[PDB]
C-alpha cells in the first residue's frame with residue numbers, strides 16, 4: 001500500500017501516501033522494473049484526430065477543477081459548483097473544453113511540481129506564465145518565442161518562464177516547435193561520419209538546411225527555429241544574435257583553457273515536450289529556468305556522443321591518458337565543470353552547481369512531505385552525472401509515479 | 415515489435431530486447447502505479463525467518479525448477495537421469511519434508527546466484543568462482559576453521575581469487591547456522607561520550623554485540639572486528655582472526671606526499687557474510703563469498719559517505735581548497751585524489767583491485783555476452799553506475815531491466 005521511504009545518511013523514515021493519487025501507469029510491474037528507461041514504449045501521447053472519450057476527459061477535468069478550487073481555499077464554494085457545471089456543459093456539447101487563464105497558471109506550476117526528473121523544483125512556485133493560446137501562425141509563434149527569450153534571459157539574471165501555445169484539437173494538426181530546445185548548436189555530418197558541432201543535433205540541423213537554411217561551418221553555430229502551425233509545413237526563423245546570450249569558457253588558473261575556443265548558451269529551454277492539464281493537451285509549451293552546471297560541463301561537453309572533449313583537455317593538462325587507473329578522465333571532467341561555473345559567474349549569468357542544487361531539492365522533499373504526503377522523484381535523473389554519492393540525494397530513497405498536471409514526451413512532428 | 419522490454423544504449427544508439435525476465439518466478443516491489451526501484455530493502459525478497467517447515471507443494475515446485483535448470487546447463491534436459499533426479503527429490507521431500515543437493519548442483523547453483531545478482535558490476539567473472547562445500551560443518555569452532563581457510567585461499571597474498579563457502583542449509587524446526595557479522599572483515603565502530611563514533615559508524619551494533627559477548631574492545635579507527643559464529647540452537651561464539659591472515663593496505667598518494675601521514679588504510683578482501691543463498695527452495699543461511707574490490711567502494715563510499723568515515727573535509731583542507739563554498743568543487747577534487755590514492759596504494763602493494771573505468775567497461779562486455787547466452791541480464795542501474803564520474807563510464811548510458819531470478823542471494827533478518 002503505502003511505501004516506507006528511508007534516507008540512509010540520516011536514518012529518517014517517511015511514508016508516501018501521495019502515490020495513491022496517481023491515475024496513470026508507469027512502465028514497471030511486479031515482474032520487472034523498467035525505471036531506468038528514458039522514453040516510454042506506450043505511455044506516449046498518441047494522435048488527436050478524434051475526440052477524447054467524454055467520460056475519461058470529464059473525470060480528468062472534474063479532478064483538475066477540484067484541485068484548482070482547493071488551492072484557492074474555495075472548495076465547495078458557489079464558484080466551484082458553477083465552474084464544474086460549465087465544464088460538464090462544454091464537454092457534453094463539444095467533446096472538449098477550455099481553461100481560464102488562472103487555471104492554466106495553476107496547472108503549469110503544478111506540472112513542474114509533479115515532474116519526477118527535475119531537481120530544481122524548489123522553485124516551482126515562481127514561474128512566469130505567458131498565455132499564447134491567442135496564436136494563429138508560425139510568424140506569431142516566433143514573436144512569442146523571441147519575447148520569451150528576452151524576458152527569461154534578462155541580461156544574465158535568468159527568470160523561469162513558460163509560454164503556452166494553443167491546445168490540441170480533434171482531427172486538426174498540432175502547433176509544434178520542431179527544435180528540441182529554443183537554442184541549440186548545429187551538428188554538421190562531415191568526412192568519415194565524424195561531426196563538427198553538436199552530434200545530438202544532426203537531424204534537426206539537416207532539416208533546417210532542407211528547408212532553406214544557409215549552414216555555417218563552425219563548432220558552435222546557433223540553429224534557426226522551425227515553427228509549425230496546424231496542418232502547415234514548418235517555417236524557418238533566425239534568432240536575432242543579440243537575443244542569444246552566450247558564455248565564452250575559460251579556466252580560473254589554466255591559462256590555455258580559453259585557447260580551446262569553447263562556449264555555451266545561457267538559456268536552457270526544452271521546447272518539444274507536451275503539457276497536460278485536466279485532460280487538455282498543449283503540444284507547444286517551451287519552458288526555461290537556468291542551468292545546473294553538470295548539464296554543460298559534464299553531459300554536453302564530455303558525453304562520448306556529444307562534444308567529447310575529455311581527451312583534448314587531458315592532453316593539454318598533460319595527464320597520463322595511457323591507462324584508466326590514472327583517473328585522467330575524472331581529473332579533466334572536474335576542471336571542465338570548474339571552468340563552466342567560473343565562466344558563467346564571470347559573465348554574470350545565472351547558474352547553479354550540483355551540490356547547491358541537490359541540497360535545495362532535499363529541502364523541497366521535506367516541504368512536499370508536509371504539504372502533500374510525498375513527492376514523485378526519479379533517482380537516476382535527480383542524482384548528478386559526476387560525484388553522485390558526494391551529494392545528499394544519492395542517499396535518499398525515492399518513489400516514482402505519475403501525477404497530473406504533467407509534462408510528457410511526444411512524437412517528433414516529422 | 416517484440417513483446418518484451420526494449421532496452422537502449424544512448425552512447426552507441428543500439429537496441430536489445432530482454433526476454434530473460436520472462437523467466438522470473440518472484441515479484442519485485444514495483445507496480446504499474448509506482449516504481450520502488452530505488453529502495454535498498456523493499457519488503458520483497460527479504461528472507462524473513464520462516465521457522466515451521468515450508469509447504470511441500472511450494473518447495474517441490476521450486477526444487478523442480480532448479481533441477482530443470484541444472485539439467486539444462488549440462489545439456490541433458492528430458493534425459494533419464496533428469497527424470498530420475500526429479501523423482502528422487504520428490505520422494506525425499508515426501509518422506510522427510512526437505513531434500514539435499516548433489517555436489518555439482520551446489521557448484522552450479524552458487525555460480526548462478528552470482529550471475530543472477532542485479533547489483534553486482536563484477537559479474538564478468540561469474541564463471542570462475544571457487545565453491546567450498548562446508549555442508550558437513552557441525553560446530554561454531556569448525557565454522558571458524560572453514561572461514562580462515564576461505565580467507566587464506568581468497569587472499570592468496572595479494573593475487574585475490576573469487577570464492578564462496580557454503581555451510582549447512584536450514585532444517586525443519588531447527589536452529590540455523592549463522593554468521594552474525596555483515597562481512598568476514600570489518601572495522602570496529604566505537605560509540606563516544608559526546609555521541610560521535612571512532613572507527614566505522616556502520617558497525618556500531620555488531621561491535622557492541624561482540625563486547626556483550628566477551629570481546630575486549632580496542633580504541634583505534636581501524637580495529638578488525640572478531641567473528642560471532644552461531645551453530646544450531648546455541649548462543650553465538652566469539653573468534654578472533656589471526657592478524658597475519660587479514661591483509662590490509664596502508665594508503666598513500668602518488669604525488670601528494672602528505673597523504674600517507676593521514677594514517678588511512680583498508681582491508682584487501684571484501685567478504686559479505688550475512689546474505690542468504692537460496693537454491694531450489696533450500697536456504698543456506700550461512701554462505702560467505704568474496705572476490706576483489708572496485709576502487710570506488712573504498713575510496714568513495716566507505717571513506718567519503720557522510721555516515722561512514724566521512725573524510726572529504728579533512729583531505730580538502732590538506733589540499734588547501736575552499737571548503738566554504740560549493741562552487742569551488744572541493745568535494746569533487748578531494749574525492750578524485752582519494753580514489754587515486756586507493757588505486758595507487760593497492761597497485762604498490764600488489765593487491766588486486768579494479769578502477770571504476772575498467773570495471774564498467776568489463777560489465778558492458780558481460781552484458782553483451784549475456785545478451786547472447788540468456789537474452790538479457792538483470793541489473794540495478796543505481797548500483798551498477800559508480801558513485802563518482804557516473805556519466806564518464808559506459809554503463810551510465812545503458813538502460814537496464816531489473817528482476818529477480820533464482821538461484822539468488824537475498825537479505826535475511828539479523829539473528830539477534
Ligand code: HEM
Nearest residue numbers: 112115117118119120123160162287288289290291292407
Ligand atoms: C530554475 C531552474 C531549473 C533547474 C536548475 C532545473 C534543472 C533540471 C535538471 C538538471 C534536469 C535534468 C536534465 C537532463 O538530465 O537532461 C531537469 C529536467 C526537467 N525539468 Fe527542470 N530545472 C529548472 C527549471 C525547470 C522549469 C522552469 C520547468 C518547467 C516549467 C522544468 C521542468 C523540467 C522537466 C519537465 C524536466 C524533464 C525533461 C526531460 O525529460 O528531458 N525545470 N531540470
Ligand code: HEM
Nearest residue numbers: 528531533534535536539576577703704705706707708823
Ligand atoms: C570479482 C570481483 C567482484 C567485484 C569487483 C564486485 C563488485 C561489486 C560491487 C561494486 C557491488 C556493489 C557494492 C555496494 O554498493 O555495496 C557488488 C555487489 C554484490 N556482489 Fe559483486 N563483485 C565481485 C565479486 C562478487 C562475488 C564473488 C560474489 C558472489 C559469488 C558477488 C556477489 C554480489 C552481491 C550479491 C552483491 C549485492 C550485495 C548487496 O546487496 O549489498 N560479487 N559487487
Ligand SMILES: N=C(NCCC[C@H](N)C(=O)O)N[N+](=O)[O-]
Nearest residue numbers: 268287288289290291292295300
Ligand atoms: N535546467 C534545465 N534543463 C533542461 C534540460 C537541458 C539539457 N540537459 C541541456 O541542454 O544540457 N531546465 N530549465 O531550467 O528549465
Ligand SMILES: N=C(NCCC[C@H](N)C(=O)O)N[N+](=O)[O-]
Nearest residue numbers: 684703704705706707708711716
Ligand atoms: N566487491 C564486492 N563488494 C560487495 C560489497 C562490499 C562493500 N561495498 C564494501 O565493503 O565496500 N564483493 N566481492 O568482491 O565479493
Ligand SMILES: [Zn+2]
Nearest residue numbers: 028033444449
Ligand atoms: Zn521500477
